[PDB]
Design a protein around this ligand. Structure first.
Ligand SMILES: *NS(=O)(=O)OC[C@H]1C[C@@H](Nc2ncncc2C(=O)c2cc([C@](C)(O)c3cccc(Br)n3)cs2)[C@H](O)[C@@H]1O
Ligand SMILES: [Zn+2]
Lengths: 500, 62, 311
């Protein structure tokens, strides 16, 4: 209809992500008559993308997803006006004024952090946002509109103890996580929460109830010698672990491995489980490669780097062996370590089609007829495979979209650094990208421009059970007041808590 | 009442509750009865519940 | 396993969903798709990406001036080319592992032996007479049969998989589902007390389909937005006659339905094509319960309903 067609040919829309949803959605928007589109994605094309990201062919592997998506679309519709950004939406160039360009934003993302950021940008710019997601056979779409609907963060959204990872693993995943931690300890950012050595202070170990109540350096000094690492990790450490007699009263003791001893012992290739010797060899081989790579370019673990992936596979399977668990195929370990979401073309195609139908109702001034739509695998009792639900109103208590939002955080102000506040709390937990924290007292604490570096316990700034912080993200045009409670009874592994 | 919660993956549970709902649903799920969202303070009586509750998770892939 | 290393890398994210054995079943299967318009192009794209052994795209019509200016398998400026021929290069290029073929002869004229080479047949934009004919041929030769169509905001899919065995994870368990001929599915008797009770809870999209199939039979084409006033008038008359004929109130299909059932809307093609292609995949791979036997989509309401009609 005339009014709607004019809106669609007229205005400009933004698609955030050029993957499974994004490629389908780009196509549907162009064929529906959307004459001006911006598309952003930070990534390059991978061969695993090609079962469902249909604008990309094998010859395009390694090029920008966004740029190729545009080129492919122009081949069937040369008159399309598409701007492609090979970039992250989290870039501060994409500020409130950037978002204000658009009559409609559509998410095509694969993680919550970026979705949180986009939510804030769309609230700031007062532009409607269609949010969506998929995984396997399932998925959903919804509409977010400032002052009309819940925002993406109005509802709470859906973790291994250190001691189960370091001392008492009982599932393959514990071993997989251990190997990821080990990779970061050896080659990556050394994080204290990713310690791999046995834990000398574990409640289950302690004999009296009074105490129960209460790595890179070394590998550098060996030249990253595989055999020395193998012995320290698979022999020396396990024997040390076997020290902690309490642990092993109940459960099967681990059995230490010796390098020389081990050395003198269908579906897809990757679905085969190899023997101990082979994984020990893989471990050695992978280290020698990684050490070489760590000289050209700390490394970041990536499931798609063969060496990084082989390292994690072998390390986790040897640890599994040590604790008397069956070892797992590289294929299985790739799923678990990489958190791979199984994905196909049809689910993304359905979701993308719904996105545009929701978009049309918005731009048609018919938001009352917008819905949350769930895609089921099987019909509900009313025979519904796609299940529409009316939109809910903003949550008055939302920590994001409410008037002057405030939260409360319980931590130990004497043991928690100002870096843990910037990273574990304001950046990660509350999803700010460019944050600015300052104490509520007539005292700049964190700065957007990197200044500061503090990075000191909290109590050394005039911060105690009752202090209040004013966290800004000027990019997100978002302010959050954090009230501090103090406590020392948090837990061996709980370093802070958002009070509910 | 005996009620059935059914999740997307066809996971069928037989609950058993009294007609006077926060305890039934026991925060990564949303709960529906024949179209309508289930509040914490909803009761079976209030909703005309004899039946089946459907549960939906938000997916985060794309 | 029974697939190459290149295929394993390409199909990785779906092997992680449905398993290598299912992927190997797809890899062995050849599909006929009739009609390369909006919905057919989506189905082609999904099946080719999924990695079937072969897809034959059959359409006897030319690209026309009235066809959309943008079609994702067809280069702009192809007015007058055969539609399947015009679709072949882009479709093949989605997945070189698939044997994508074109057939330019009218489906009606095809001998019964033409169908036997295929594991599943999917009809789009065909007449009721043609749907019944080919479903009968498919039942003879135990070939999985599907049809679907989009009209404005609405769309539908239908399957006849005969007696259909599959596995489903509870460990896998083997199950059986039985489907009926499309003739029965399209000619339900609404007389009995049973039927009269069923009717209460039947989507009106099923009568919409009866109206639109009869328009296609009467006119040789679907409603078009260029002839909206002319086509709207006839659709209203057909509503009256079709519903009166089945002993149902004509007012079950609201009077303004004509506003919402014209043309091919691309997002509706994507939804309906996604659902239909995935039923084909399930049927070919014998994994997961197939929808028995109609899926109806209303893109104004965001409803997608599965009805079992015919028995
Ligand atoms: N579902 S899918 O995988 O098939 O396709 C999804 C699509 C989403 C796109 N991601 C993306 N695109 C634009 N802007 C941002 C994103 C991000 O998801 C993120 C970027 C960051 C940060 C903070 O920018 C970052 C973190 C870690 C590494 C890097 Br490099 N940058 C965080 S989240 C995917 O590429 C995919 O095509
Ligand atoms: Zn909110």
């Amino acid at each position: 209809p005339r009014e709607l067609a004019e809106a669609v040919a007229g205005g400009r829309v933004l698609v955030v992500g050029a993957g499974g949803i994004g490629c389908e959605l780009l196509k549907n928007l162009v064929l529906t008559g959307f004459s001006h589109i911006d598309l952003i994605d930070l990534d390059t094309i991978d061969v695993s993308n090609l079962n469902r990201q249909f604008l990309f062919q094998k010859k395009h592997v390694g090029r920008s997803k966004a740029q190729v998506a545009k080129e492919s679309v122009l081949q069937f519709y040369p008159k399309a006006n598409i701007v492609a950004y090979h970039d992250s939406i989290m870039n501060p160039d994409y500020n409130v004024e950037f978002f204000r360009q658009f009559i409609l934003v559509m998410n095509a993302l694969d993680n919550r952090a970026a979705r949180n950021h986009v939510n804030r940008m769309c609230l700031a710019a007062d532009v409607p946002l269609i949010e969506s997601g998929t995984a396997g056979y399932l998925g959903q779409v919804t509409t977010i509109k400032k002052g009309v609907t819940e925002c993406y963060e109005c509802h709470p959204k859906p973790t291994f103890p250190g001691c189960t990872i370091r001392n008492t693993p009982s599932e393959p995943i514990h071993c997989i996580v251990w190997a990821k931690y080990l990779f970061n300890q050896l080659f990556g950012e050394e994080d204290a929460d990713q310690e791999v050595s046995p834990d000398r202070a574990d409640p289950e170990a302690a004999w009296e109830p009074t105490e129960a109540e209460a790595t890179k350096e070394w590998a550098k000094s060996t030249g990253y010698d595989p055999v020395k690492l193998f012995t320290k990790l698979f022999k020396d450490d396990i024997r040390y672990l076997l020290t902690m007699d309490k642990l092993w009263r109940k459960r099967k003791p681990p059995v230490p491995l010796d390098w020389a001893e081990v050395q003198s012992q269908l579906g897809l290739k990757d679905q085969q489980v190899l023997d101990v010797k082979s994984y020990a060899r893989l471990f050695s081989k992978s280290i020698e490669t990684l050490r070489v790579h760590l000289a050209e370019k700390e490394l970041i673990w990536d499931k798609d780097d063969p060496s990084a992936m082989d390292f994690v596979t072998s390390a986790a399977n040897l640890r599994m062996h040590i604790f008397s668990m069956n070892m797992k195929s590289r294929f299985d370990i790739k799923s678990m370590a990489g958190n791979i979401i199984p994905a196909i073309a049809t689910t993304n195609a359905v979701i993308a089609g719904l996105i545009v139908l929701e978009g049309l109702k918005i731009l048609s001034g018919k938001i009352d007829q917008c819905r949350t739509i769930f895609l089921n695998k099987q019909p509900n009792p009313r025979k519904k495979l796609l299940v529409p639900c009316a939109l809910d109103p903003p949550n008055p208590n939302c920590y994001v979209c409410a008037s002057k939002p405030e939260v409360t955080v319980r931590l130990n102000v004497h043991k928690v650094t100002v870096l843990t506040l910037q990273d574990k709390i304001v950046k990660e937990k509350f999803a700010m990208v460019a944050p600015d924290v300052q104490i509520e007292d007539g005292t700049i604490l964190i700065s957007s421009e990197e200044e500061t570096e503090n990075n000191k316990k909290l109590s050394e700034f005039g911060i105690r059970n009752g202090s209040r912080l004013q966290a800004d993200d000027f990019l997100q045009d978002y302010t959050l007041l954090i009230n501090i409670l103090h406590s020392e009874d948090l837990g061996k592994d709980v370093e802070f808590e958002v009070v509910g | 009442i005996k009620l059935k919660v059914i999740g997307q993956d066809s996971s069928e549970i037989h609950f058993k509750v009294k007609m006077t709902l926060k305890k039934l649903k026991e925060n990564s799920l949303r709960f529906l009865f024949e179209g309508q969202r289930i509040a914490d303070n909803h009761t079976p009586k209030e909703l005309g519940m004899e039946d089946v509750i459907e549960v939906y998770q938000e997916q985060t892939g794309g | 396993g029974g697939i190459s290393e290149e295929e394993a890398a390409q199909y990785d994210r779906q092997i992680r969903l449905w398993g290598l054995e299912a992927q190997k079943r797809l890899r062995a299967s050849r599909v006929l798709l009739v009609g390369l318009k909006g919905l057919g192009a989506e189905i082609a794209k999904n099946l080719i990406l999924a990695g079937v052994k072969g897809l034959t795209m059959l359409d006897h019509e030319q690209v026309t001036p009235e066809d959309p200016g943008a079609q994702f398998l067809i280069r702009t400026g192809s007015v007058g080319r055969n539609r399947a021929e015009a679709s072949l290069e882009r479709a093949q290029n989605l997945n070189p592992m698939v044997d994508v073929k074109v057939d330019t002869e009218d489906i009606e004229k095809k001998p019964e032996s033409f169908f036997t080479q295929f594991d599943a047949v999917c009809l789009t934009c065909c007449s009721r007479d043609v749907i019944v004919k080919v479903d009968q041929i498919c039942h003879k030769n135990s070939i999985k049969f599907f049809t679907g169509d989009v009209f404005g905001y609405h769309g539908y899919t239908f399957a006849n998989l005969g007696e259909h065995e599959f596995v489903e994870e509870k460990t896998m368990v083997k199950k059986k589902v039985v489907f009926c001929p499309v003739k029965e599915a399209l000619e339900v008797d609404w007389s009995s007390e049973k039927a009269k009770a069923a009717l209460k809870r039947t989507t009106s999209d099923y009568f919409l389909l009866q109206v639109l199939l009869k328009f296609r039979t009467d006119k040789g084409r679907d409603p078009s937005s260029d002839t909206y006033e002319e086509d709207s008038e006839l659709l209203l008359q057909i509503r009256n006659d079709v519903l009166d004929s089945l002993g149902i109130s004509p007012d079950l299909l609201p009077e303004d339905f004509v506003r919402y059932c014209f043309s091919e809307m691309a997002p509706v093609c994507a939804v309906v094509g996604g659902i239909l292609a995935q039923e084909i995949v399930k049927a070919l791979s014998q994994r997961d319960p197939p929808h028995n036997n109609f899926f109806f989509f209303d893109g104004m309401k965001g409803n997608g309903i599965v009805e079992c009609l015919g028995p």
